[PDB]
Amino acid sequence: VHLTPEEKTAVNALWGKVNVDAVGGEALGRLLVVYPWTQRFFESFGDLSSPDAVMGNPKVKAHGKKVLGAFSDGLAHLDNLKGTFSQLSELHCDKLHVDPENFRLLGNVLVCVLARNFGKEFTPQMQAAYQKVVAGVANALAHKYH
Amino acid sequence: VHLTPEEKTAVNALWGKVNVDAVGGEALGRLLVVYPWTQRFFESFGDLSSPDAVMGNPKVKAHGKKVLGAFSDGLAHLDNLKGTFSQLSELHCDKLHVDPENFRLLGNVLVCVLARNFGKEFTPQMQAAYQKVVAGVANALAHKYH
Amino acid sequence: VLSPADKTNVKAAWGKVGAHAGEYGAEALERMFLSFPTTKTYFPHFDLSHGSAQVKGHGKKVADALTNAVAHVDDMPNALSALSDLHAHKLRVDPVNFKLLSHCLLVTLAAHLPAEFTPAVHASLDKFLASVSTVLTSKYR
Amino acid sequence: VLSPADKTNVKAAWGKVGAHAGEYGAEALERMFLSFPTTKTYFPHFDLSHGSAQVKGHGKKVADALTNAVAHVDDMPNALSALSDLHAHKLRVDPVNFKLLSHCLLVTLAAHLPAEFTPAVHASLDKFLASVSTVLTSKYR
Numbered sequence: 001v002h003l004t005p006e007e008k009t010a011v012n013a014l015w016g017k018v019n020v021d022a023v024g025g026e027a028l029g030r031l032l033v034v035y036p037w038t039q040r041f042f043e044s045f046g047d048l049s050s051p052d053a054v055m056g057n058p059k060v061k062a063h064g065k066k067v068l069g070a071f072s073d074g075l076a077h078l079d080n081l082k083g084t085f086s087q088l089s090e091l092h093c094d095k096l097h098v099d100p101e102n103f104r105l106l107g108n109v110l111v112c113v114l115a116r117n118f119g120k121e122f123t124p125q126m127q128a129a130y131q132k133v134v135a136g137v138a139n140a141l142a143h144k145y146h
Numbered sequence: 147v148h149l150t151p152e153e154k155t156a157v158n159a160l161w162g163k164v165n166v167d168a169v170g171g172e173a174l175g176r177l178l179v180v181y182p183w184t185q186r187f188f189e190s191f192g193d194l195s196s197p198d199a200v201m202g203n204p205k206v207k208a209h210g211k212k213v214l215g216a217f218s219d220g221l222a223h224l225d226n227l228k229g230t231f232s233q234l235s236e237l238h239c240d241k242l243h244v245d246p247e248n249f250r251l252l253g254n255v256l257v258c259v260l261a262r263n264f265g266k267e268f269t270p271q272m273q274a275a276y277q278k279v280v281a282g283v284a285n286a287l288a289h290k291y292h
Numbered sequence: 293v294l295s296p297a298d299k300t301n302v303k304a305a306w307g308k309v310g311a312h313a314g315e316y317g318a319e320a321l322e323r324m325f326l327s328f329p330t331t332k333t334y335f336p337h338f339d340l341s342h343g344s345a346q347v348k349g350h351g352k353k354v355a356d357a358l359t360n361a362v363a364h365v366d367d368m369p370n371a372l373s374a375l376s377d378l379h380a381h382k383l384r385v386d387p388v389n390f391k392l393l394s395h396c397l398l399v400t401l402a403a404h405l406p407a408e409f410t411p412a413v414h415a416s417l418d419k420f421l422a423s424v425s426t427v428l429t430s431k432y433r
Numbered sequence: 434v435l436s437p438a439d440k441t442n443v444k445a446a447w448g449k450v451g452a453h454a455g456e457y458g459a460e461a462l463e464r465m466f467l468s469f470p471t472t473k474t475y476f477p478h479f480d481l482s483h484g485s486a487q488v489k490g491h492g493k494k495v496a497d498a499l500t501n502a503v504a505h506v507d508d509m510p511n512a513l514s515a516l517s518d519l520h521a522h523k524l525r526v527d528p529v530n531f532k533l534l535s536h537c538l539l540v541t542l543a544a545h546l547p548a549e550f551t552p553a554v555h556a557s558l559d560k561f562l563a564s565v566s567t568v569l570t571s572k573y574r
């Protein structure tokens with residue numbers, strides 16, 4: 001992922017303000033509520049029967065933080081996303097059988113969560129930069145090599 | 147794309163019997179009829195307002211041969227589809243802005259055409275091998291988005 | 293959204309399929325499990341071996357559901373609510389899998405009914421299957 | 434297929450948007466043009482270098498169409514037939530672009546309505562926009 005010097009500064013400036021405990025759980029929670037079928041992959045997490053159950057689920061919150069941790073690792077190595085995430089892509093594809101389309105969906109949910117939490121500060125320009133970042137992460141986890 | 151020595155022999159044997167003057171045109175024609183928005187990319191072809199208008203359009207048949215030729219080149223070097231489709235990827239992605247999902251659709255339409263033309267010969271095993279082939283071709287054309 | 297012509301094409305085409313619907317349903321599943329192996333994870337307790345009686349019988353039930361959808365093409369959500377319950381509420385099947393099965397059914401039809409599987413029919417059936425897929429993967433009660 | 438809860442969520446959320454609808458529609462468009470530059474090829478005659486009066490005025494038309502779709506959520510094919518004629522028959526807009534605009538509208542709503550954009554409302558709005566997109570990209574005359 002190439003980001004202009006201005007974008008990298010803007011992106012990292014915002015990420016430095018992110019409360020991973022709140023944003024991570026909200027992003028994973030919204031994924032499961034907005035795209036219901038993703039709940040199948042998280043059966044072991046317990047009760048995911050309703051929006052309230054999902055958002056208040058302890059495992060969902062804790063796991064969302066780990067997801068955000070992976071995004072953090074991505075932002076720190078934008079020039080080596082596929083190398084950084086190859087093990088993760090293997091886990092998600094070969095072991096968990098997660099269809100690639102879902103990676104894009106989580107990226108978009110995260111973008112919506114950033115917008116909800118930062119409001120006006122999440123400008124069209126800030127979004128444009130983050131879209132490049134989430135697209136890079138999703139592409140790295142899908143890992144459609146040749 | 148990884149095909150066993152037997153899948154490769156099977157895929158090439160079937161391909162060798164393909165009617166090169168019609169199959170490509172049938173696949174492109176079906177793409178244009180089944181997924182209507184794809185017509186926007188071929189407005190210079192004139193009338194495509196109906197199934198018969200599309201399938202009988204000489205420009206569709208002619209262009210289909212070009213598409214078929216590309217698949218032939220792909221089958222000839224299954225281990226380097228990326229390099230083989232490098233220039234084509236530039237054209238479709240950077241120049242025409244064709245969304246990647248459409249590459250997958252044409253691949254699937256081609257599979258349907260092969261099944262229609264070969265019938266009982268296009269076994270579930272034959273299809274499985276070809277799905278790998280068209281997925282690899284679509285992936286290679288989408289490399290500029292990677 | 294299906295046009296009047298789409299509905300006529302689907303009804304005409306499925307009528308041609310006739311009593312062979314069950315067989316085509318089984319083959320579609322067989323083709324899906326082989327081309328897209330991950331789909332087998334949805335049937336862990338099934339005997340998925342090629343030619344399995346369980347797959348054959350299941351394919352007939354799938355075909356019967358499609359026949360019912362054709363008969364109620366203008367009110368599918370209502371006609372298929374029990375299948376939405378199963379696929380969306382209980383099984384939580386990923387919509388991508390419906391595209392895979394729909395595709396394999398179109399391949400099956402093309403292989404068996406070359407003359408009837410015209411571009412127009414192909415187009416109408418694809419939309420019909422997409423609509424059925426949306427109903428089965430949506431929670432709307 | 435929207436559930437009763439989805440329809441209520443969407444009507445309540447859009448009701449809250451109220452007269453800001455036009456502005457949000459314009460912002461969603463600007464976000465789409467900026468984040469996904471390829472979408473600009475559909476508006477060659479528009480002043481897209483910024484949030485021009487043309488983009489604002491167009492955002493208003495889009496918003497009004499959505500307001501109409503929200504009001505007639507159970508009769509969208511008929512209610513938006515003119516928009517289907519334009520998007521599906523004349524412009525032949527690739528469906529991917531509707532996902533892009535829909536996503537940008539959700540981002541806009543989230544940024545402006547933090548408290549109203551709950552997970553449930555977000556979910557309902559996404560399905561609603563997907564249904565609207567299907568209508569506008571489908572040929573059903």
Ligand code: HEM
Pocket residue numbers: 038041042044066067070071088091092096098102103104106107137138141
């Ligand atoms: C594109 C963004 C995503 C990122 C960055 C991400 C990251 C991660 C990470 C870091 C783990 C932890 C595994 C470990 O300890 O090494 C994980 C686990 C997992 N992920 Fe994802 N993931 C993403 C998307 C998805 C999607 C879309 C799904 C499916 C809907 C999914 C399903 C799972 C499942 C089922 C697990 C295992 C959970 C468990 O039982 O512990 N992930 N992911």
Ligand code: HEM
Pocket residue numbers: 184187188190212213216217234238242244248249252253283284287
């Ligand atoms: C299996 C995937 C595809 C293959 C192998 C393929 C192959 C080709 C080839 C070989 C050409 C000829 C280039 C030349 O004249 O030098 C071409 C042109 C073109 N393709 Fe594709 N294509 C694929 C998918 C698509 C899709 C999905 C679209 C859009 C819906 C598309 C739109 C076009 C257009 C607009 C042209 C230029 C037509 C013209 O003005 O002459 N292609 N393609």
Ligand code: HEM
Pocket residue numbers: 331334335353354357358375378379383385389390391393394421424425428
């Ligand atoms: C054209 C779309 C589909 C139709 C019309 C359809 C129809 C049906 C029907 C009628 C049943 C049987 C209910 C009963 O009488 O017990 C069923 C069961 C089931 N379907 Fe589907 N289905 C479709 C797609 C899918 C897809 C894509 C998957 C996932 C790969 C799937 C997974 C299942 C599973 C796991 C069961 C339950 C099997 C069991 O344990 O008994 N279906 N389906």
Ligand code: HEM
Pocket residue numbers: 472475476494495498499516519520524526530531532534535562565566569
């Ligand atoms: C939620 C989805 C959408 C809605 C509700 C919508 C609505 C509308 C409306 C109401 C018009 C104006 C018709 C009139 O003249 O009165 C319009 C025009 C147009 N739309 Fe959309 N639209 C949507 C998505 C899209 C997308 C994704 C694209 C492509 C990026 C697009 C491209 C266009 C174009 C090119 C025009 C004609 C503009 C002109 O020349 O004036 N629309 N749309």
Ligand SMILES: [C-]#N
Pocket residue numbers: 028063067
């Ligand atoms: C991963 N959630």
Ligand SMILES: [C-]#N
Pocket residue numbers: 144145146289292
């Ligand atoms: C690498 N694509």
Ligand SMILES: [C-]#N
Pocket residue numbers: 082143144145146
């Ligand atoms: C390339 N991976």
Ligand SMILES: [C-]#N
Pocket residue numbers: 145
């Ligand atoms: C790619 N390496």
Ligand SMILES: [C-]#N
Pocket residue numbers: none
């Ligand atoms: C990878 N090239």
Ligand SMILES: [C-]#N
Pocket residue numbers: 144145146228
């Ligand atoms: C990269 N292959």
Ligand SMILES: [C-]#N
Pocket residue numbers: 174209210213
């Ligand atoms: C390219 N057809």
Ligand SMILES: [C-]#N
Pocket residue numbers: 082292
């Ligand atoms: C490959 N990057």
Ligand SMILES: [C-]#N
Pocket residue numbers: 321350354
């Ligand atoms: C159901 N297969």
Ligand SMILES: [C-]#N
Pocket residue numbers: 462491495
């Ligand atoms: C229409 N935008």
Ligand SMILES: [Fe+3]
Pocket residue numbers: 082143145
């Ligand atoms: Fe790699």
Ligand SMILES: [Fe+3]
Pocket residue numbers: 144145146285288289290292
């Ligand atoms: Fe690549």
